[PDB]
Structures are given as structure tokens and as C-alpha cells.
Nucleic acid binder design. Sequence first.
RNA 1: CGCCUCCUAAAAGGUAACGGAGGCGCCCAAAGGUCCCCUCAGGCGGGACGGAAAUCCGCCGGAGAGCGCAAGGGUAGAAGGGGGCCUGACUGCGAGGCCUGCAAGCCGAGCAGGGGCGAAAGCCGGGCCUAGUGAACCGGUGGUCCCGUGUGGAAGGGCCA
Lengths: 85, 136, 182, 49
Amino acid sequence: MAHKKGLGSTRNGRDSQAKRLGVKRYEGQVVRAGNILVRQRGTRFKPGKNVGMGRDFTLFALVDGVVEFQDRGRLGRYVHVRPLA
Amino acid sequence: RMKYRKQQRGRLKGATKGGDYVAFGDYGLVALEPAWITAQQIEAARVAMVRHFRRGGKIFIRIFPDKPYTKKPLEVRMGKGKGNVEGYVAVVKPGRVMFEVAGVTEEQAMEALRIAGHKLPIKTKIVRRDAYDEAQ
Amino acid sequence: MPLDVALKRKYYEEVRPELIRRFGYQNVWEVPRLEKVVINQGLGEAKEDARILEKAAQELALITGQKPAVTRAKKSISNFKLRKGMPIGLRVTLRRDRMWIFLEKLLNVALPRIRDFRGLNPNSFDGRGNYNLGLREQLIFPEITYDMVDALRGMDIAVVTTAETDEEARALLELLGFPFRK
Amino acid sequence: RIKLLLECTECKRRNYATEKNKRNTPNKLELRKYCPWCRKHTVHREVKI
RNA sequence: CGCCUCCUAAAAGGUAACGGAGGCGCCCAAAGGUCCCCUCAGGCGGGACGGAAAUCCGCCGGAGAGCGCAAGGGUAGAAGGGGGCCUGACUGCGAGGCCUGCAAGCCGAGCAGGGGCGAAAGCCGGGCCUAGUGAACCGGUGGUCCCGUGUGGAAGGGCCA
């Protein structure tokens, strides 16, 4: 008396908003304070000279510097801002 | 079969090549053109062999009951969480080092395999130890 | 009292060079002397809190300077694997001389003293030649009388020695404070 | 309503500053500090329900 | 049927699916400041009330114990474990950037008043961080002391909190 399918909605209600962060400011490019560079939800980044780590593990330009990519090899990743020009 | 005390529900699907080769006793069954193979079928061979071999002196192993295959529903219409666990087996694809001993000493072992796999499920080949292997 | 003080002073001062070169021939070093001594006892869970905790007091006290308050069962021994922080650290880490009139008073003046108190203990320290042996019953009246029926008993102390390897350490407190039988 | 209720700071009749706060542990106990725009900084006090 | 975390986004970033998984719609009055100290679990060997596992001694160790809460990132060159003193979990504010079409949400040197931790080289405009969140109307209260429908006041009302 009525063979038509059957209920079946087990459920995987999963979700994660999109995001940002990362290696976000190109070699050498003109990098001014206020200008953010590389955000890290960790510590792949050590705020070297003029590199200001914001109250969030966010690499922000502390000075008018040329984009200073300072991978200090093994010490870890070290970010730096070079004395303008 | 055996893929006991797993950890997750299911895998996914692909295939192409891997890392099976060696030897391990000199009574070898190597796949060639497969993919996953029923843990069962597997046991099948296991049997086949075991029995043939005057029914005693142990064979060895090879692959494992590896993944969880799901036909999900039972035959419904499709949209389940794709849930349902059901058939568990091997994932061997490029002629793989399938290793089986016993002490047959011969084309007797041969037969054993012959059927085991002839059976099992694919284009495959068999042999012994052909170019040793040096580790650290 | 200060009597046995001068005592340990000498026991060791002389015994030291004594065996020191008797076998050493290194340079009269801590080959093999003894330094500082911590003492530990029957953990707070042995508690009643106010009562036997204060008794732990009396005792730790007249014994070597330090005497228990009221807190001995937190994060509780509870049921088997049932325990949290560890607010029951009741011990004396006193460091030197006091310690020596102690090697004295203690080992050499209270050693055998109560119920079959013999001492026929194998490899006393042995865990690197530094201590081992704590006794499982107070020096009864190392002072005080009935100031608690069960009062205390789980007693065990430890010395920080340099008596390096055993045989050596053995020479050390063996003749210095008595090596309990085989 | 939970052990989390909102209060705010006011200062010796010469201002009031805000901020929420709680209820739990030491409950009422509510002096605190803060600084109003009164004078240049100044105690303040806090309390105020 | 809103948000955080991991996979699939396939290597920039970034994307469905009735695709996998799994948490939050709390608080923490001091896990909020800073100054001074300390420094894991676990392995082994030796030990009172032990007695697989406390407490203490003796070694050993890319730190896998740890950080309210889930994941992930980080990370004891401690954000982690302990002591002292204290409120900036400040108002005025910010240049200049993250992402975003909307509004959002988010990062912040430095100038001012004003303090607090050291003697100070300086840190502090809440926490170790990524979730604890809600326009607009409407109306309340603590202001303020701007407006008042001739003028004085006032019902009432504009901006602040």
C-alpha cells in the first residue's frame, strides 16, 4: 500500500567562515607603517626591526621601510622594515 | 578481514600506483592491474592457499582490509549523508608485492596461488625472489 | 646535645680523610662525603586536617624545625585515579650542619630504638649512593610523649651525597653512621 | 541573570564611567578605581548599580 | 537554517554538496598590569602512612605534558608554574593597512591629558590568540544644562553615557 522511497537525512551540519591572514606583503615593495604585512595565527613570524606584532599575531608596518623579507633561516621567519631611503 | 578498531568512517576514491615489490619467503603472488580488493575475497585466497597446502605450514600476508566501502542506502534514491559502512578491503594497484609462504616447495604453491588469485579479482602475476634488496 | 654535635663533627671529620686515602687516592674529594638532607613523611592524605595535621606539626617541629597546619587531602586520594593539584608538600629541606648534628642524633643516637628496631637492610641507598632508608615508625620519643595516639609513623628522609658509586658511598655512611647488616 | 549581571562605575558625584562586570565570586565587593573625566583622572571609585 | 576550528580550496587566496567531522550564544572580580623568581609529562633506580598512580631522594628528556572552554595555529628564546606591588578591562584619538561591492568586523605605531610595574632601557588603552554576537525603530535610566513653537519657566524635548 504505497512503495515510494523512505526517509533518510542523517546530518552533517558543518561550517567554517571564510578567512584571511598569511604572507601578504610583497618583497621590497614600498612598505609604510599602518600598512599591514603578514598576519599569523601562530609564530612563524618574529617582529624584527620596525616590525610590529599587533595584539593578535599580526605583522604590521612600524616604519617607513622597504619590504624587508628576513627569513632568518632556522631561527625562524624574521620580518624586517628597511630604513626608507 | 581485519581493519579493526579503525578511527574514521570513510575514505574516497582514485587509484594509480604505489610501493609493493620485495619478496619475503619466495612464494609470491603479486597483483598487477587492480585497485581495492575485498578483504573477503582476500580471505578467500587465504583459504584457498591454506587449504591446498596439506592444510598447515603457514602462509604469510600482504595487503590489508584497509578502507570502508559504502553503497550507502540499500537501494533508495540518493542523498543520504552518504553514511553507512559496509564492505572493507585492500587498496593495491600497481602489481603489488602480495606475499604467501607455507613450504609447498613447488608448482604446488603455484596452484595454490593459481586459484587463489585467478579468483581474486584481476589481471595479475606471480613468482619468487629475483633481485634481493639492501637496506640500512 | 651540642654534645653529640661536636660528636658528628668529629666522627666524620676524621673518618673522612681516614678511608679517604685508605682507598681513594684521588685528591681527598667528596670521595665520598655527604651534603644537605631533605626529609619527607606520610603525605597529607594521612590527614584529619586540624588534628593529625597539627601533629605532623609538633613532629616536623621538635624534630628539625618546621611544624604542620590544617590541609591534608585536596584533589583527594579520592577513588583510585581521582586526584587534582598536590597541596600536601610536607617536608624539611634543611641544608647543612643542623643536618649533621642530625646524622648524629638521628642515625647514631636513635637508630635502634623501639620494637625489634634492628636493621638488617640490603643495599640501603644504592640508587647512586645518596641515601635510602626512612624507617616505618618514628623515633618514638625523639622527644614528645602521647601528643596523639597514632600520631605519626610513615617516616622517611634522604641525604644529598656525593658518595658517588655505591661500594664507595658504602664506605661512607657504613662506617660513618652504621651499615645495617647484609 | 546568571551569576553574570551588569554593573558600572560612577565616581564621587563628579562623573560616571561604565563597563559591565559580573556577580560570581566576591559578589558585591565593588570599590575598584578607574578615573573619570573629572579633574585630570581622579579616583572615581566605581561601585554604582 | 548565526559563529569558531579541521578536511575537500587541488598547494596564493579563495568555492558548493541532504559532503565529512566537531565545538559556542560561558566568563575569568581577578587567568585584567608590570617587576622578581621558577621551568613539563613521561622513562628509569631508590625509598614512611606507599604500596598499578601520591610524597621525597637519585639520574634521563625537538618540550609529545601546558595555556577555563572544540579544533587548529602557536608556542616553555614559556603565551606556561610561583611571589610583590597595581589598575589603561584609561578618555581624547589615531596615521596608515587586513579582508568587503553594501554595512560590517578586524590590525595599529605614534601625539595629548592620566595615571601604575622598575631605579630605570620600557610594558599597560583586558586576557595567549581565531567563536561568548544582533541594524533600525520604540521606549528607560545616570547626564547635560543645547532647544522651547510671544516672554519668564515647563510638559515636553536635541547630543553624551
